[PDB]
Amino acid sequence: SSKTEWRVRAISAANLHLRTNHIYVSSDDIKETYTYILPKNVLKKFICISDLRAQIAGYLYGVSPPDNPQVKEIRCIVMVPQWGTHQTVHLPGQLPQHEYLKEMEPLGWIHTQPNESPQLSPQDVTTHAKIMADNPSWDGEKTIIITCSFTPGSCTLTAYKLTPSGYEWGRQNTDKGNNPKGYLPSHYERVQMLLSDRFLGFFMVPAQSSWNYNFMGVRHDPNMKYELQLANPKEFYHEVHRPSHFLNFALVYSADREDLYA
């Protein structure tokens, strides 16, 4: 509708700080054979800069701790300009490249989900398989899909690893529906993921445009390039993310109370 539901979405996003205190992690069906050492500060910064309906996604680029090859620590979160619905995300084809991202390895992408889903999404798995097949830097056993879903009064987070047969099925299939052919439960796999309260995570924002583009789908393009830089991302329902809602009004005989107590 985008007339009165936007106010309800802004009122729901204004109270998003209460869900960051009770974070739930799905500690079940773990393979226990690298783990995620992403901190909670980057998750709190990315959970308050998203919407309850529009799926916000971001690439995770981090390095491994010293003397620990079986653990991955995402220290950088790059927010690419995207505009997706409540079931899929339209990620751009241009990969984020910067000086701070040249020393870390991309651990995949993480997309917010409006509903708590127990199984992995086939469209997100197909998008991760297409990103792994197109970009040679994204590996199969090194990139994960952290599907941080939405919980009532909580922040339910759940990771998902890409299988090689699942990556082949996602690269072979091209349907963007709700249930394409070839979808298998063995295409995804849950991975170990724990929080961290010792090292802070960096954020990357585009310098030309903003990270949120769902308010104007014509400006967002799948092949448009972007230049990321170390900055703080803005909110989803911000004044800079929705330019049409602000610059829409048109351009003197009242009480002119001048020289007041101000």
Binding site: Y100, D197, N232, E239, F246, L251
Partner: protein, 1068 residues
Amino acid sequence: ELQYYLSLLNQQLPIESQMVSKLPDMLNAEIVLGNVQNAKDAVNWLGYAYLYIRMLRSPTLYGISHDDLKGDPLLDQRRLDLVHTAALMLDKNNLVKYDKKTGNFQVTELGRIASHYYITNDTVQTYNQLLKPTLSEIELFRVFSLSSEFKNITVREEEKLELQKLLERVPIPVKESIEEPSAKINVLLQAFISQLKLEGFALMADMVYVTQSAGRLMRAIFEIVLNRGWAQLTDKTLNLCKMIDKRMWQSMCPLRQFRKLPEEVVKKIEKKNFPFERLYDLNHNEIGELIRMPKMGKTIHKYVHLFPKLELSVHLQPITRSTLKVELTITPDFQWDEKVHGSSEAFWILVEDVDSEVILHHEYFLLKAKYAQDEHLITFFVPVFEPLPPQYFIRVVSDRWLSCETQLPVSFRHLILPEKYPPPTELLDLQPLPVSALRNSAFESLYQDKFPFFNPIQTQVFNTVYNSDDNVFVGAPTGSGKTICAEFAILRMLLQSSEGRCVYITPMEALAEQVYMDWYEKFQDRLNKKVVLLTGETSTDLKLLGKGNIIISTPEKWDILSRRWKQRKNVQNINLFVVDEVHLIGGENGPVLEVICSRMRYISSQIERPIRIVALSSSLSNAKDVAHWLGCSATSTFNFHPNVRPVPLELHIQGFNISHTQTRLLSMAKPVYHAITKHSPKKPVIVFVPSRKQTRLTAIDILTTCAADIQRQRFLHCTEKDLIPYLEKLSDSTLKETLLNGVGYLHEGLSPMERRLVEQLFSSGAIQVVVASRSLCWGMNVAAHLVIIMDTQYYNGKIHAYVDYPIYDVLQMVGHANRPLQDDEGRCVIMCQGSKKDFFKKFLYEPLPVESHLDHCMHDHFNAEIVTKTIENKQDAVDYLTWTFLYRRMTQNPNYYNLQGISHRHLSDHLSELVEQTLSDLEQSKCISIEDEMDVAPLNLGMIAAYYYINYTTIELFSMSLNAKTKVRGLIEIISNAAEYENIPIRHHEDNLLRQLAQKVPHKLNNPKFNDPHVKTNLLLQAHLSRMQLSAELQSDTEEILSKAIRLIQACVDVLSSNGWLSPALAA
């Protein structure tokens, strides 16, 4: 209503005082202005108003009965009841802390923000209970609309359709219903911000009044968010204030705030999705062709060049393990104009972490038009915790221009932070050593009448000083008894060798003179030892070193003797080397003292005679590097704690939110007098002034504050009969009039005999206040109970900026109020700005580590090493630099020493680069010769600079400015433009005297500058050569110029004789 109109037009309507409604607001304004502090002061302020006169003249109109007027004819009980009601209203609204027991009221930040923005008490309470750090932009409008200013604004039923039409067109959504007045006020503010057209006249008047209240409400909310520390809330409040001031949305064009831009061109620029930074990079034709309007392209380019957009550069230096120094250089990259920017442009710079929610350092910057187009450097202290972020964000936003904010990512990934500081050596809980603990009777006879037992730190250091002779590093604060340990070490050196050569090096000349005067009465009078003081003459310094056994000197005076230590046999045959106040080796006389210590350590390890080194300094954090660089042992390192002083120091910090230095100095006079009256009523106090001329103004303000209250002349504990011989010797009548009330004055322009008489009057207990200048902090031979350091800064006219006070001068001012027997404790109240209060609180209790800054003044040390045949190659220079404190400081703090790592290869590459830079600076100034880029050879100009203690740049200027046909007027300008005349003091109100003195000089100056020190040195030399009259601040600079003018003329005569010139040498 005809009766009031008939009474107002025929003089029948008296004016009734309605001050009872705004009485808590008036009490909060009087508490913020400092006029009322207690209930009696509030009652006295209320009695002088028209409300008390109206209650006394008409009690029935003020609600007072006949029994209230009969029982209180002066209206004191009703005024006390009104003051108590205003105090309860201020305490309930969290505006001012008011105690009901004593009646004193202390104005808080919320009450000061409500008084400075004319906000009510209920509005301040609503802003205190409604503003949250995690609040969004939708809740901010509801919090600003729920203030006490719009409490009478009601939502009319006839304007419900207009409010419903404006609710669907407002860019900011409202969570409340259409029947709520707060949502109606928010919709009116959104219509006034987005310039939406209204329909009702009363609704438009209500929207205009709501905007006029919401401007001050958003200003107070931004002040409260800056005081609370919420970075995102302060950014949202600043964006709302810019949107209310510019009357445009946040997504609007930046050219819409300027009145010279057309509306059609602004609409065409806003229709195209183009950033404002892309228009600044384009020319006048490209911006016209991109916006499809080439006629308005030049105006768009002028508006882009006139829009405020400066370049910010961040330089981080980790000093300690928890705090770092951040230098922000702001360069104005825009066309400064009075029609766009005005006379000055105000900006708010907030440095915060990567979360952008907790503002770590918030400050303001007012770039003036006279200082425009110049990068200003602001130094701040940035704290660092154990969860260090990868990068911090410094956002500098414009306080007047909308959508003008520059973000600087300061990266902390490659920051080489130092390690943890070692704990200090605590004093053992043993029995104190009596006066009979010493072995020699002559050493005990000079300290028996002073104290029967030594200090516990002195008793712990006597086992390593009197019973040993190794290098002892004693880190003790000012007042712990370092002079007793120095006297014990001197007595041990005299008992070990009767013909020893003790050398006590102190950076301050006044402290060295005080140490020489103490040794003349302690070592020369009671022990009959040759105690002498070294001067600035190299001919008498060798005789004083050969005939004196205890030579008190300066590192600038000992650098001439340590440079010829291979030739002078008296300097090599030393028995004791005491270094007093070595904690100031990172500031003034820092690299000179470091080079003197390195030369002493090199001469002690190459003459087969280990000299007993005793380094007495303050409590330092990185004492291990100072012990390794000076050869101090682990068992002799008696570095105590800053809180281990025998006199307990209570440090208070008074932060005043004032950007101007003069306004902060004028506003901190009455709180300084209140703190002096509340802390030390019957004890002497020392007021550290910012400047010399400000000391008399601070003394006059303290005398006016003493005479304003009932304690008139309370600072004079003695009688006028004892001060009448004391006031008859002074020259200044204003100083004698201030000392007659008990407030003595001391500055750099005052007489030395008058300063000694004022010190003798303050030490005897006649005066209770001594207003001393900032230059007299270290040179003060007096101990008081209270130390009020008011506005500890310096208005430098050479850079035209308010530079902060150094840590060494602040430590000397805090340690000056150390009374062991006069007072039980010592209060130190530092009244400064709010941004410098955290650094002053961190550098007070925590030990300040030593940072070697010898890399900036290594050219003179390299020239002195090459002229003395010490550093003959690059390896010899690297070995000489490795034995100094810079190699110990770079191994502990790589990023503070401009290194990229603490590895051996990186340190060797940095040392090789520094040696190559020193060799290039020596060869470019014709001071040395580089043979095959490996060997260093001393030249004639370098030897002449090292012999007369001159710099390489001044020697190069004297060699390139003196020709074969020079005169005296050219030689005076060449000597005035040297490197030794660049340290001339430049303060405020000094350009007019330099302009008036330039018209009476015998030699004209080709385009003189009022802010350059060389033109001031030339004017002082022309005034001294013509014997013209000058002020005290001019004579204090002329004496310091003439103290080095003899050496400058000697170096010029040597350069003229070396070049083969007779007539310029005769003219010189």
